């Protein structure tokens, strides 16, 4: 009976895989052969931040494209101002250990979590002397790897128990669970419309989840090793994915294919973070090799290189205005780049 | 207006004041990762320092420690172990008696030693349940040569100091298991990290300072590793 289900599953997979050829009538390389490349890009440092004691793991821009927060493993969650290099708040945590951080679109709240399995939400505009924990999102069995705000109330979280979850902060209970992943889910990116999000896990596969329904709309795969980072193309019809196999892969949602693999023979270390530019031409991926390579997302050629940090670059971000890129790293220095 | 820019500069004074005092306490404290099997007795050692993560703090000779027991997550430990690379020293506890799961513990130690991110951090090994191994050998039902054929033709090393009223038969076995741990420690030989094996039991009213003395050696050795004094 177990063999019956295994055999029955194979023809369902076989017909799905066979259909993907029919879709693959050409490659992106032939259609993008004509276009001239971006060529040489010269990104310089602007505003090397200081203040953090231990390695920076995560960061996030705000909607204003001015304030950014980042969490480090020392247990400080401090919000800078990029232009003035100044610390507006320095929020202590209970858990030195924090793998994620997100800044609310309203900017009233801010998210973080790690080994406590709590996406702790903090009020920035507390009338009192110091900021206070609004609501502890307890219930995940495993470490929180990424949590990101949908709205002031709705927040999506990925844990180390292979489950994504939407939470409601007012109610204080997990509303929607996302089951399907085999391995630990590492990253999220919300869609521009905030109706869908993609999430990569330690199984070399990404899954497109519907927020309202709570079911996997579509399953993406083709990566060789544990996936680490994931980000939508700003259109929201496609996304790139960094993995330990030291390549980035663009996946179209509509086409259900893997168009391009961003690999250079020399690079043999995993990708930790990925982000797109506002144009969606400069795919800048942060590597474990203590540098950040700016890939041309169209031509699959390294336009430039941002060899800033001493230790591994953990987190990336691009501003909503698309002025600059920030790169938290294990040397405890957020360098803002432009 | 530019007047408000002075306001944030005054706020930064309090922010900087708090961070600078927070740096003092941060650098003073020693982070330690407590790793081990379910049956290893991680929880037993935490009872000895009378002075879902479980953090414990103990003062020994007025230096603050923080030892992190991680027993909440799933068995998959390839992406949450990365976060303990800044840690001073991984207190790796192992059950000597559980011979079947001893090889699996050895394989776990090999992965920790040869990990990219944990390459720089030394592992304070606690060979726990030494007393329980003592009565197990006298039973003589379970035999190491069944699981480890090299034990059959293995004599005790010269650098052995058995406790009073210990059989030589158990002493060879006792120092074989550590030798198997220390086999991995020497294979890479880049001098970046160093296993500190110790033989411990439940009745041991110690190890508060055994970790202190070993962590003292790494802090001393890490200074000398800079000068090229070794």
């Amino acid at each position: 009976e177990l063999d019956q289900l295994r055999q029955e599953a194979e023809q369902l997979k076989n017909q799905i895989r066979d259909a993907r050829k029919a879709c693959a009538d050409a490659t992106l390389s032939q259609i993008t052969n004509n276009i001239d490349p971006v060529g040489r890009i010269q990104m310089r440092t602007r505003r090397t931040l200081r203040g953090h004691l231990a390695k920076i793991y995560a960061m996030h821009w705000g909607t204003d494209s001015r304030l950014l927060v980042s969490a480090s493993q020392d247990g400080k969650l401090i919000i800078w101002d990029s232009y003035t290099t100044n610390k507006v708040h320095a929020i202590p945590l209970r858990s030195s250990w924090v793998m994620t951080c997100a800044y609310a679109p309203s900017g009233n709240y801010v998210a973080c979590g790690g080994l406590d399995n709590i996406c702790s939400i903090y009020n920035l505009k507390t009338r009192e002397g110091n900021v206070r924990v609004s609501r502890e999102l307890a219930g995940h069995t495993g470490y929180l790897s990424c949590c990101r705000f949908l709205d002031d109330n709705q927040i999506v979280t990925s844990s180390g128990d292979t489950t994504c979850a939407l939470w409601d902060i007012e109610t204080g209970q997990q509303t929607t669970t996302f089951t399907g992943h085999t391995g630990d889910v590492m990253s999220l990116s919300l869609a521009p419309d905030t109706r869908l999000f993609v999430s990569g896990a330690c199984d070399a596969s990404a899954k497109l989840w519907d927020v309202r329904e709570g079911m996997c709309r579509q399953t993406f795969t083709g990566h060789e090793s544990d996936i680490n980072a994931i980000c939508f193309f700003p259109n929201g019809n496609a996304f790139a994915t960094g993995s330990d196999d030291a390549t980035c892969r663009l996946f179209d949602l509509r086409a259900d294919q893997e168009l391009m693999t961003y690999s250079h023979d020399n690079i043999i270390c995993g990708i930790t973070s990925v982000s797109f530019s506002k144009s969606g031409r400069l795919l800048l991926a942060g590597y474990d090799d203590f540098n950040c390579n700016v890939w041309d997302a169209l031509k699959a050629d390294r336009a430039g290189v941002l060899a800033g940090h001493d230790n591994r670059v953990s987190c990336l971000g691009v501003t909503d205005d698309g002025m600059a890129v920030a790169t938290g790293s294990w040397d405890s220095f957020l360098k803002i780049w432009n | 207006q530019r007047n408000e820019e002075k306001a944030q500069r005054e706020a930064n004074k309090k922010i900087e004041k708090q961070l600078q005092k927070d740096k003092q306490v941060y650098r003073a404290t020693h982070r330690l990762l407590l790793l081990g099997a379910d049956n290893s007795g991680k929880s037993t050692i935490v009872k000895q320092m009378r002075i879902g993560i479980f953090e414990t703090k103990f003062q020994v000779d007025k230096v603050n420690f923080h030892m992190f027991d991680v027993g909440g997550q799933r068995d998959e430990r390839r992406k949450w172990i990365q976060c303990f690379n800044d840690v001073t020293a991984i207190i790796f506890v192992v059950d000597s008696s559980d011979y079947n799961r001893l090889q699996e513990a050895l394989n776990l130690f090999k992965s920790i030693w040869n990990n990219r991110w944990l390459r720089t951090i030394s592992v304070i090994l606690f060979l726990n349940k030494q007393d329980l191994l003592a009565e197990k050998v006298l039973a003589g039902k379970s035999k190491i040569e069944d699981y480890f054929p090299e034990f059959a033709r293995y004599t005790t090393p010269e650098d052995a100091t058995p406790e009073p009223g210990e059989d030589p038969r158990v002493t060879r076995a006792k120092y074989f298991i550590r030798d198997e741990f220390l086999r991995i420690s020497t294979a890479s030989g880049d001098g970046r990290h160093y296993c500190y094996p110790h033989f411990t039991c439940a009745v041991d009213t110690e190890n508060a300072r055994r970790i202190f003395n070993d962590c003292r050696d790494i802090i001393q050795r890490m200074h000398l590793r800079q000068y090229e004094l070794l």
Partner: nanobody, 128 residues
Framework: QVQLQESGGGLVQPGGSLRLSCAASGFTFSNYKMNWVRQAPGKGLEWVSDISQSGASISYTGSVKGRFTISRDNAKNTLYLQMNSLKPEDTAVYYC?????????????????????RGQGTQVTVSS
């Protein structure tokens, strides 16, 4: 798509032989370290053996040391295991496993319950 589909294995008298295979597909075989893992009846996953990317640092659990022999053909993209002497304690399902990271000397979680890069497994059994 990463997939390890085994072949061979089955019923055999004690002291017999069995050539297991682990035809790997949807990734480059050549760059990854592989491993064998067996699951005994009413026991956790257990480690069998290893291969260090070229066949250089191969190791065994000690219980099966000096009996089994691993090889790989990078051209054919296949993993092998040899059986010569088989005890009752050796009746178990044998999963072929791959190391998570591509250019590493550490393998984590390969004996985990729900490891991603493990095959369907072959039930190797010894009985009258």
């Amino acid at each position: 798509q990463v997939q390890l589909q085994e072949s061979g294995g089955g019923l055999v008298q004690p002291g017999g032989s069995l050539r297991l295979s682990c035809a790997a597909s949807g990734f480059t075989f050549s760059n990854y370290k592989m491993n064998w893992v067996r699951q005994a009846p009413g026991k956790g996953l257990e480690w069998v053996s290893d291969i260090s990317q070229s066949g250089a640092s191969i190791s065994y659990t000690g219980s099966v040391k000096g009996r089994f022999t691993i090889s790989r053909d990078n051209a054919k993209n296949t993993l092998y295991l040899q059986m010569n002497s088989l005890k009752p304690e050796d009746t178990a399902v044998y999963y072929c496993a791959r190391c998570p990271a591509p250019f590493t000397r550490d393998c984590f979680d390969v004996t985990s319950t729900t490891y991603a890069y493990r095959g369907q497994g072959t039930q190797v059994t010894v009985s009258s």
